[PDB]
């Protein structure tokens, strides 16, 4: 049974990218998937995506460029203590000059850099680079 609907939508993307494709269809979408999808787009790591509306939970068609090496999800949504955002980006980003930890704070689903600028923290969804 599906536990993280996010995990599927991320994985599926990575596989397409690796197989050299330009688009994925993902299922079944959520508010969370969209917002995560939205961040990736804000930074260029995908192009345009589209919510098709089955009267169910949704499908998404993403159009990706090729600037994406990995988009992973952090399986338990660990709480992060704003002091320890550092430690996370370190463990799992390629360098300090690009790439993002994207997490869920009380003030919206935001990449860690925005999170720093706004001074909020919370639990941690995946990442992109």
């Amino acid at each position: 049974t599906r536990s993280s609907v996010l995990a599927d939508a991320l994985n599926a993307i990575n596989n397409a990218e690796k197989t050299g494709k330009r688009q994925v269809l993902i299922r079944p979408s959520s508010k969370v998937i969209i917002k995560f999808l939205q961040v990736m787009q804000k930074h260029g790591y995908i192009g345009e995506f589209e919510y098709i509306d089955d009267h169910r939970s949704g499908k998404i068609v993403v159009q990706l460029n090729g600037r994406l090496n990995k988009c992973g999800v952090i399986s338990p949504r660990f709480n992060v203590k704003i002091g320890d955002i550092e430690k996370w980006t370190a463990n799992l980003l390629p360098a300090r000059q690009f790439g993002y930890v994207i997490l869920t704070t009380s003030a919206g689903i935001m990449d860690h850099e925005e999170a720093r600028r706004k001074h909020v923290s919370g639990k941690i969804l995946g990442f992109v680079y």
């Binding site: 399986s75 338990p76 949504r77 660990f78």
Partner: protein, 96 residues
């Protein structure tokens, strides 16, 4: 995805499991069973003073042919009987 639980509340199982498995550590087990204090001729202390019972002439294992000069010692705090090597050329001449 194989192994261990991942969940945010599964701390206990994760600690317990480690506890259970730490036992396969050869050193950990010795520490916690207090093997030292229990077996082992010395107390668990670094050295032990004893008394010389007889002088032995242990024959060495293969592929070496020799006679290793040794002594039977009865540790004082213990009564535990032990055999010990006497290092260097001659030295058995010093013991009695």
């Amino acid at each position: 995805g194989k192994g261990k639980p991942r969940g945010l509340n599964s701390a206990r199982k994760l600690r317990v499991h480690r506890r259970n498995n730490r036992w396969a550590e050869n050193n950990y087990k010795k520490r916690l069973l207090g093997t030292a204090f229990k077996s082992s001729p010395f107390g668990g202390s670094s050295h032990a003073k004893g008394i010389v019972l007889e002088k032995l002439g242990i024959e060495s294992k293969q592929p070496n042919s020799a006679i290793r000069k040794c002594v039977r010692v009865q540790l004082i705090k213990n009564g535990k009987k032990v055999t010990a090597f006497v290092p260097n050329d001659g030295c058995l001449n010093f013991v009695d």
